[PDB]
A = this chain, B = another copy of it.
Amino acid sequence: PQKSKPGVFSFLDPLAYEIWMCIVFAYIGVSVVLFLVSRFSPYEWHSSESTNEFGIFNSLWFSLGAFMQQGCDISPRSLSGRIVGGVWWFFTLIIISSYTAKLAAFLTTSALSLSNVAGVFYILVGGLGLAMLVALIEFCYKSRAEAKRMK
């Protein structure tokens, strides 16, 4: 019957949902293994500060930056951390290239309309609002702690 317009989350169409789930799982596993191989050894520490800054939060940030082809301010320096980074880089290259090719196949001339990216705009604005809320919550908690210490 009537033509179905593109979905709001239509940017996920080129890859199957199982691929997305396994991508999330691989991201989590890569971040955990990177943090483990970077921080577990007592001989990489020095009250005591680590030689590298690859904690779990920083490992997750590094993996997310690598997957998005952006990069961050830190890079692994040990052999095992560099092995993790290299395999993650190869995985990212293959997956992103496949996604771009399949997106080119799927978008089928006519210019792309805002209805095709309204979902990514919604996600962006929601993320900005969440970040603002988190920052305000942290500020309120710190101010309350300061007031409690004062009184």
Q: Interface of A with B (CB < 8 Å)?
A: 11, 13-16, 18-19, 22, 26, 29-30, 33, 36-37, 40-41, 43, 57, 61, 64-66, 68-75, 77-84, 86-109, 111-114, 116-117, 120-121, 123-128, 130-132, 134-135, 138-139, 142, 146
A134 and B83 contacting across the interface, CB-CB below 8 Å: yes
Copies of the chain in the assembly:
4
> Does A19 lie within 8 Å of B112, measured CB to CB?
yes
Residues of B within 8 A of A13 (CB): 111
Q: Does B108 lie within 8 Å of A105, measured CB to CB?
A: yes
Q: Is the CB of A111 within 8 A of B14?
A: yes
* Nearest-Cβ distance from residue A58 to partner chain B, whole angstroms: 9
